[PDB]
């Protein structure tokens with residue numbers, strides 16, 4: 001009973017938390033339950049007809065946890081065991097950062113929306129790398145986790161002048177333990193970060209990251225210890241996470257760069273600064289997540305799927321709460337889905353519930369498997 005993510009008490013506690021308890025306190029308590037391995041867990045074998053892949057990344061189901069949920073990689077095992085196929089830890093920076101001043105996170109239950117001005121609070125690449133190493137050693141001994149995927153989102157310290165120096169630092173420390181690297185050029189809460197989405201700068205960033213990963217492989221290929229201590233046993237793939245607050249010319253220029261640099265995937269999208277209809281967020285700063293971002297980010301998937309001529313796989317992030325939401329992202333062009341706000345508002349049952357809803361929908365719509373639906377809207 002207690003172990004079951006749908007155990008009736010979780011929804012009762014969650015409704016109480018969302019009404020009376022500060023958002024960051026709720027999150028810290030979630031993390032503490034995860035640290036002491038007392039979160040519920042999903043005991044289901046996932047349907048093989050809902051598996052999916054990006055390149056050699058073989059996802060056991062299409063639902064992962066988005067970056068920012070476990071910034072320091074302290075809760076990996078327990079979050080995955082809720083029923084998710086992967087998690088993106090981070091965003092990490094070379095040096096630790098406490099972030100912007102609190103309160104900096106606010107929820108609106110009515111609209112299932114969040115606004116945050118966190119500012120890349122994390123313990124720093126060195127410490128997070130130790131946390132990921134601990135997970136990778138537990139995984140090596142637990143066959144229950146051997147196929148789960150862990151990506152690492154990397155960014156810059158607030159005061160760093162050249163973003164690439166920070167990106168290279170992170171690759172050389174944590175890259176060997178990552179199944180993929182996500183380049184974060186889209187947070188709205190680090191001044192100047194989003195300027196790096198300009199095509200010229202983005203191109204140099206992508207080529208520099210790819211070159212640093214390639215040098216990691218070259219210089220350690222005949223080491224006694226195998227270099228890739230991750231799930232794939234291969235060098236990490238490289239993804240870029242994009243902001244939805246771009247004009248059509250910027251989107252097109254970005255897509256051209258993604259085609260020329262052979263990026264492995266794009267994460268569409270980060271939070272938006274263009275929603276101001278949420279009364280309770282008036283005179284609050286930061287990016288908005290959740291239901292009000294669904295349509296914006298789904299339209300953005302369709303745009304980039306077409307601008308890249310379907311050659312760049314897509315990871316969907318933005319207002320996914322239901323199996324219908326997930327199928328809309330997939331038919332729009334996405335190969336896999338990331339959740340954040342769904343976890344906040346639906347709680348422990350999030351993965352069990354959305355996986356069941358998507359499966360039934362694949363049945364109803366007549367698909368043989370999930371891959372058949374990718375980009376079918378087009």
Ligand SMILES: Cc1cc2nc3c(=O)[nH]c(=O)nc-3n(C[C@H](O)[C@H](O)[C@H](O)COP(=O)(O)O)c2cc1C
Pocket residue numbers: 066067068069071090091105114115116118120153184241269270271288289290291293317318319320338339340341342
């Ligand atoms: C409190 C909070 C912190 C986040 N931190 C990060 C982060 O560090 N890196 C990142 O790439 N995205 C971060 N995000 C964005 C999420 O990963 C996700 O893209 C966004 O919330 C949209 O998905 P959703 O509508 O399902 O919440 C954060 C979001 C929230 C709400």
Ligand SMILES: Cc1c(C2(c3ccc(C(F)(F)F)nc3)CC2)c[nH]c1C(=O)N[C@H](C)c1nc[nH]n1
Pocket residue numbers: 013014017018022023024025026027028029030033068069105107114343344345346347348
């Ligand atoms: C509500 C919630 C949760 C859940 C939770 C938390 C606590 C408990 C309980 F055991 F205490 F009852 N149950 C569920 C749904 C699983 C995790 N995080 C949050 C949350 O608000 N996070 C905000 C947006 C945040 N703050 C920093 N980064 N993000």
Ligand SMILES: O=C(O)c1cc(=O)[nH]c(=O)[nH]1
Pocket residue numbers: 068091116117118119120121184186187188189270271287
């Ligand atoms: O740490 C943050 O403030 C943050 C980063 C990010 O990429 N997205 C976001 O909404 N917040």
Ligand SMILES: [Mg+2]
Pocket residue numbers: 093094095096123124125126127
């Ligand atoms: Mg460090």
